[PDB]
Ligand binder design. Sequence first.
Ligand SMILES: C[C@]12CC[C@@H]3c4ccc(O)cc4CC[C@H]3[C@@H]1CC[C@@H]2O
Ligand SMILES: C[C@]12CC[C@@H]3c4ccc(O)cc4CC[C@H]3[C@@H]1CC[C@@H]2O
Ligand SMILES: N[C@@H](CCC(=O)N[C@@H](CS)C(=O)NCC(=O)O)C(=O)O
Ligand SMILES: N[C@@H](CCC(=O)N[C@@H](CS)C(=O)NCC(=O)O)C(=O)O
Lengths: 219, 225
Amino acid sequence: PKPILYYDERSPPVRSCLMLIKLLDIDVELRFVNLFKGEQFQKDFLALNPQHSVPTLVHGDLVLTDSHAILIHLAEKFDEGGSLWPQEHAERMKVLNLLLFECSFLFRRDSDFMSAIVRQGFANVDVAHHERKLTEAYIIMERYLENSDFMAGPQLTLADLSIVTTLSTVNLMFPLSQFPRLRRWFTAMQQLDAYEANCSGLEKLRQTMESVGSFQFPS
Amino acid sequence: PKPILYYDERSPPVRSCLMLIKLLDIDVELRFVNLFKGEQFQKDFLALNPQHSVPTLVHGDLVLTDSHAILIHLAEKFDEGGSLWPQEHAERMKVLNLLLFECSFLFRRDSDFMSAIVRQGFANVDVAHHERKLTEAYIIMERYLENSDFMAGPQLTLADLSIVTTLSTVNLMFPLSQFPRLRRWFTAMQQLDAYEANCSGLEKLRQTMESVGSFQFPSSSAVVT
Ligand SMILES: C[C@]12CC[C@@H]3c4ccc(O)cc4CC[C@H]3[C@@H]1CC[C@@H]2O
Ligand SMILES: C[C@]12CC[C@@H]3c4ccc(O)cc4CC[C@H]3[C@@H]1CC[C@@H]2O
Ligand SMILES: N[C@@H](CCC(=O)N[C@@H](CS)C(=O)NCC(=O)O)C(=O)O
Ligand SMILES: N[C@@H](CCC(=O)N[C@@H](CS)C(=O)NCC(=O)O)C(=O)O
């Protein structure tokens, strides 16, 4: 049976999965879970995913509750022989390492900031603290790009799909003007056909955050 | 060349790698990085791992900066064909899924709490807030174990090694009285010879945290056997 993706396109890790789906022409049934209405706490979705998070994928009996597993699963099932999830062990571990950076560091800091806005209101958030934490992530990615065109080497991989959606989201608030490699990489990502899958949810997130946070992003 | 592990055994994700190294009898060189002295900000270690975190593995030219990548790499290289990182695709995805739960949810909440203690002192932490967040993680692990014997299926996998070290750390502070599947599973993990690699760093972390945060963990909380 075809995969079912539970999603809210305001979520960057959702948008990474949407980008992979578009890149690989995957036939997926979409089911919208409105996070800002708390639908991720509805009894049946909670039973499916106790972490009450999107993206969640149901593919037959397999239930995945993390975008990075979903990216790897879909690449392994629908892109055997591709370069997104490379077959050679060392290259694959490098992609995996950067997927985990996205999970552990970049998204953690993005989510910490966005959560603070939703909970406290933008006027009551320590923006300087979060600017420091998120600029530290920019600095790391700029170094990651020193000897490669893409995040994990010379070719586009799953790591780029995972990072670019969160990066585009952090970049709602914090510009890339000071980071030449990161800005060039982001511009190149924006040229890919599959990047169109990021656009609608980024803008919906912008609009939702500004309304819920009572502020305007600088951009 | 033999793998090199940059480590501070007080870190639960370090201890997960130590457990796998013991379980598989991998010969690894250990290089200590004292996180409470800020040695992870030394210029050469920062150049190696810009995230200034342990564990960090150097294996030949490969540099891994996340425990979950280290566990998977070492299982592929030293448990080839084995069941810790299982061969069938769906079983492997389940293990990967719970490795990411550890990274995204359980460890995130453990480190939010531990960092707050170190940065603020225990007396100035909103302990009730962190109790709610960490009990929520207990509830989720209890749900996974209501439907499966181990975290990711019927046998020991990398997911159990990743999760048990952080669970043992959270349980320094928060009791498991209300979580019978978690207690049964944790007890079984404690019977494994490989669990001996968790014990020393767990106790060092307890000692360090009590000192730096000026508090005592409730001795009654930790599951011991
Ligand atoms: C604010 C929430 C936590 C942080 C989530 C987040 C975190 C990071 C991000 O880039 C986008 C979002 C959108 C949905 C947000 C969630 C909607 C309700 C929930 O509490
Ligand atoms: C407190 C730090 C962040 C949280 C880290 C942590 C986070 C979770 C945990 O179980 C153990 C530790 C030990 C090292 C801690 C770090 C040493 C200094 C750093 O600031
Ligand atoms: N590591 C997870 C993070 C998933 C996550 O945190 N999703 C957020 C949206 S960006 C969510 O669903 N929040 C709802 C909630 O926590 O209640 C992944 O990569 O899928
Ligand atoms: N997701 C990473 C988490 C690594 C991590 O945060 N390690 C902590 C210790 S538990 C660390 O090294 N903190 C030092 C610092 O941030 O400066 C992994 O699994 O390896």
